[PDB]
Design goal:
Blueprint lengths: L2 E5 L4 E5 L2 E6 L4 E7 L4 E9 L5 H16 L8 E5 L10 E7 L3 E2 H5 L5 H20 L12 E3 L5 E3 L11 H4 L8 H15 L9 H9 L7 H4 L4 H9 L8 H4 L10 H17 L10 H4 L11 H4 L12 H13 L1
Antiparallel strand pairs: 1-2, 3-4, 4-5, 5-7, 6-7, 8-9, 9-10
Helix pairs in contact: 1-13, 3-5, 5-10
The structure holds ligand 34I.
The ligand N#Cc1csc(NC(=O)CN2C(=O)CCc3ccccc32)c1-c1ncn[nH]1 binds next to strand 4, strand 5 and strand 8.
């Protein structure tokens, strides 16, 4: 038999013999191992009875189908998909072996970043988001914990979307959305790279909206009327805020600006934040326009952005789901 069992913290990883010296980075649970066939490190993800519920089964199938479908240098790639269980009656675990990077984007927010590396990181996030939007996939739940970094600094994205600090007002207020809903989430990550404090740290959905209007200000009347009247009632009732200007939100001291190059790049950065951190999606800058911003466009590469783009969203019983995933694991 090809596999071998190894104990890792709580769970028992029973992987192939090609993967050796596993190291835990979990929560699915994630292990970092060495592939002996490919001669390089990989990331193994144990899906523990992934068909356990519709939320689990729907996302896991979504993450399966899309990764073997999509192929980008900013969305992590699948290298091997397998299961130790031979039959469907025995089927219990799905292992997703996929490309390994060096660190998490949270680990990066704890650091001082020069404009050169920061604007390149952000550029990369936009490239993947753009390419996802061209497949008809809008992420929505974009977060740093779901973005991985190499010591390059090259960037890749782990998940495909759908801790809540990075969701857009329209997502929070159930308005319905469009492509540029991921420009909000980036502006939350960019501003966090600056402050090092999380921008809108709300304990609940209602509490999080307060931390938006305190800093940015109560959105325009034109925006208000597009809401669910029942929800619109609540927002129109909340106190009015003048909304602090972006120099006051991101003061001089935050940015590295000792040289003239840095001084210019600091305003170009704040000019970007100001366009991304907008409450009304009708006034919020688009991915296409953001890549053309003087801060970002210095990295532009059509070979990456304008790359070729590559089924439904249905309910299934957990008996129906099982077979569905097993089918796509056996491929
Ligand atoms: N799936 C998958 C993954 C494919 S790659 C990857 N993670 C990385 O590449 C980088 N990374 C982390 O992110 C967590 C911290 C960490 C420590 C040591 C080595 C890599 C990582 C993951 C992952 N790590 C944690 N959850 N998911």
């Amino acid at each position: 038999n090809q596999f071998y069992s190894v104990e890792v913290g709580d769970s028992t990883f029973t992987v192939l013999k090609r993967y050796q010296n596993l190291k835990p980075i979990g929560s699915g649970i994630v292990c970092a191992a060495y592939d002996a066939v490919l001669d390089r490190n990989v990331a193994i993800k144990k899906l523990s009875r992934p068909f356990q519920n519709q939320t689990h089964a729907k996302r896991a199938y979504r993450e399966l189908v899309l990764m073997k479908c999509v192929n980008h240098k900013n969305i992590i790639s699948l290298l091997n998909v397998f299961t130790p269980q031979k039959t469907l009656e025995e089927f219990q675990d799905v292992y997703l072996v996929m490309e390994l990077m060096d660190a998490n984007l949270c680990q990066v927010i704890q650091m001082e970043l020069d404009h050169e590396r920061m604007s390149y990181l952000l550029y990369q996030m936009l490239c993947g988001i753009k390419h996802l939007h061209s497949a008809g996939i809008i992420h929505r739940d974009l977060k740093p914990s779901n973005i991985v970094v190499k010591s390059d600094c090259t960037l890749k994205i782990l998940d495909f979307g759908l801790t809540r600090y990075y969701r857009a007002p329209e997502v929070i207020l159930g308005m319905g959305y469009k492509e540029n809903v991921d420009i909000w989430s980036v502006g939350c990550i960019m501003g966090e790279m600056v402050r090092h404090k999380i921008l809108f740290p709300g304990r609940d959905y209602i509490d999080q909206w307060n931390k938006v209007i305190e800093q940015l200000g109560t959105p325009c009347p034109e925006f208000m009327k597009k809401l669910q009247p029942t929800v619109r009632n609540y927002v129109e009732n909340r106190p009015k805020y003048a909304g602090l200007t972006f120099p006051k939100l991101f003061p001089d001291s935050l940015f590295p600006a000792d040289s003239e190059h840095n001084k210019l790049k600091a305003s170009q950065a704040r000019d970007l934040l100001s366009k991304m951190l907008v409450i009304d999606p009708a006034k919020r800058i688009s991915v296409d326009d953001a890549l053309q911003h003087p801060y970002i466009n210095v990295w532009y590469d059509p070979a990456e952005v304008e790359a070729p783009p590559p089924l439904d969203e249905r309910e299934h019983t957990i008996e129906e789901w099982k077979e569905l995933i097993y089918k796509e694991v056996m491929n």
